[PDB]
Amino acid sequence: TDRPDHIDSRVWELSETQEDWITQVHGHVRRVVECWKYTICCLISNMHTHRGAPQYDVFKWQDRSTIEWICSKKKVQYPERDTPDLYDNERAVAYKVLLVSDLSDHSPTSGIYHDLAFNLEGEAEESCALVLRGSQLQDIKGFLCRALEWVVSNNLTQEVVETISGEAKLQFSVGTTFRTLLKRDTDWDVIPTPRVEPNVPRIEGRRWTQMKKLPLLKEKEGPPSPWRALLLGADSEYIVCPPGTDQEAISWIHSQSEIECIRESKSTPASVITCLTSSLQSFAEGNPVRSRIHEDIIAFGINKKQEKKQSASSSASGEWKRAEYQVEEMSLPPWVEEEMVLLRSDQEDNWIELEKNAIYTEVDGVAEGLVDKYIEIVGRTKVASVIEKWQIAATRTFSQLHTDRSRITACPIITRDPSGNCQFWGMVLLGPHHVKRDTDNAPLLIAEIMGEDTEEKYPKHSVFSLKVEEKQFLLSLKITSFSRNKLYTFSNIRRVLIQPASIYSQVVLSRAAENNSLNLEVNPEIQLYLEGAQRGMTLYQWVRMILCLEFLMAIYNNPQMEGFLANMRRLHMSRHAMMERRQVFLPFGSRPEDKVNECIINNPIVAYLAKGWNSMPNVYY
């Protein structure tokens, strides 16, 4: 522990309760120095006998009663303030061990004892050298030199010299004016000494109340929330194109396409469609970056901040007031349930093609079997296709944002099937961007293929009819502003598959551990509150729409969603406790539902989760 290596364990133990080291300057160093002196005393009195008894008797670190008991028999007496360290019976002289930093200038001390002065290098004073034997000198020099080596190894030379000299600076001291500065904002001194008797009073407190029924999360009222996301989701579709590169696919599409406006929104003027076509042209000859056109100003909001500032200044009137921002509250839209019902239908392709890990052991075999089962139960699903589309679009748009450009960049969304045919999900146009931070927005124009058009779901989307090889498709073409951090996050959106895989693997492995054998084909009947009533349901489709809802929450993650999910865990735990006949008690002013209700403003999936929570029973018998 704190014992130096050269100090003997017995000496260290004996020195613990000899002086109050905490109040002394450099208490540890002082204790080490006292141990040095005691070890020197031990080395002086080493196996030396005169009349069958030890020649030297050591008075250091011994009880004072016995010291006086043996001091009377020697016809001597010493005061309490300074007692000699040892005494020589053969010569009958009291000796005190001293350590000094310079033997050249040393002077005697009080005549009650003689000083055995030693240097930090093991040297001894001339008289001290002549009194002791050569073996004692060598042993003392060796011990002191080992101590010096320990000191220089630990860089403690200054402290050791200070303790030897005895100046003993307090190692810290607060001056006069600094104390006045410190005591400005407090009613106590530097060391507070209140004049009150320590006591804990009795305070009349409130009563803890049982939560007999679970709280009911309030549902906001207002217009249904529009689809506020970067991409379409379940309405996303693609166009089949002959196998080849992205440039070849875009050239094939552009040369064989007809665009006709069928629904125009005020948020996204239809006149910007030319922009997209221009980008197609630019990307047809392998130029993903094109010069600006007029409609780009409308499309990407070029110089919009300055125009809005001038308009505000022209229309400015009244008196300055605080900000007082307002967030519009919107109700749960009908399209969330349709999104849940969709996005789950089976697909022809697997849409999850992950290279299989190596298999060496049976543990590896069962792990890869479980992963393969999960992939084949959630692979052929619209969620996987939409996840692939989102990841491809996010990566393609992110890769074009680590620079400053005043031109228009095209980021096509193209995937490929096992057969090799291209699949056109849409294109992303990145406008003039000069990013200084990772959180600022950049303009984007998102053209993508719909499957079905809803006015109440896409109010800011201008839907176009696209004719390609006697085939009809719909086009979204929305104007948006999106950030670098969000794009990077959605570039790794494939990680959302872990949580439903976690549920599936936990169920399967729990069943395996219960039966002490792995089945790998279990599809048990999970009991769930479906329509306010508890019904059974297969595990595979449970994992399927768990993945659906996880993806829906991942793309709709905002402060409201973060707060709602963070505060819903307490209510989830309370419900789980009450279904096991456990009572829940709450403090006086306890309203756990308020911290959840404050986060329910306009997020459609937060409202969907709130409705799901309200649907299930609140009272458990």
Binding site: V152, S153, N154, N155, E355, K356, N357, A358, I359, Y360, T361, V363, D364, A367, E368
Partner: protein
């Protein structure tokens, strides 16, 4: 150019039970990576990962336990990625880096324990340099003309 490595598009070599195993060693053990390419990817003289400054090396049970020469990171796939292009304090810290590097080269023992040499940096490294040259087993004239040029 066959891939032969995970970052080169080869089939994964790490399994669930081989999370802790290095890729190169595991591929060598399984025979997926022959010695012909092993002697190339693990070259300590490859230009890809060659350090810009000479480095010091120990020599166990050797007359001169300190050999300084050019070095490269063994794996050619441990390269560095180029970056696009308190100000004077950064130059001061670069000077501190230079002093730390020369101290580490001349005082290997502080590489394992705390620094406790007495005196200033200049005098301490001067004495250590004189001592190490004195123990170089070279002849006398070499030693004198080497210590002649020490500032």
């Amino acid at each position: 150019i066959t891939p032969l490595l995970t970052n080169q598009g080869a089939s994964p070599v790490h399994s669930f039970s081989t999370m802790h195993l290095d890729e190169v060693a595991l591929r060598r053990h399984l025979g997926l990576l022959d010695e012909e390419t092993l002697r190339r990817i693990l070259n300590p003289n490859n230009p890809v990962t060659q350090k810009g400054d000479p480095s010091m090396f120990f020599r166990i049970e050797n007359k001169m336990p300190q050999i300084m020469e050019d070095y490269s990171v063994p794996s050619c796939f441990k390269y560095t990625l180029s970056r696009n292009r308190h100000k004077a304090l950064l130059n001061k810290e670069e000077r501190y880096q230079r002093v730390t590097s020369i101290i580490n080269k001349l005082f290997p023992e502080v590489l394992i324990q705390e620094a406790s040499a007495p005196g200033t940096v200049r005098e301490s490294l001067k004495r250590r340099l004189e001592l190490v040259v004195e123990r170089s087993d070279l002849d006398e004239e070499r030693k004198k003309r080497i210590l002649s040029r020490i500032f």
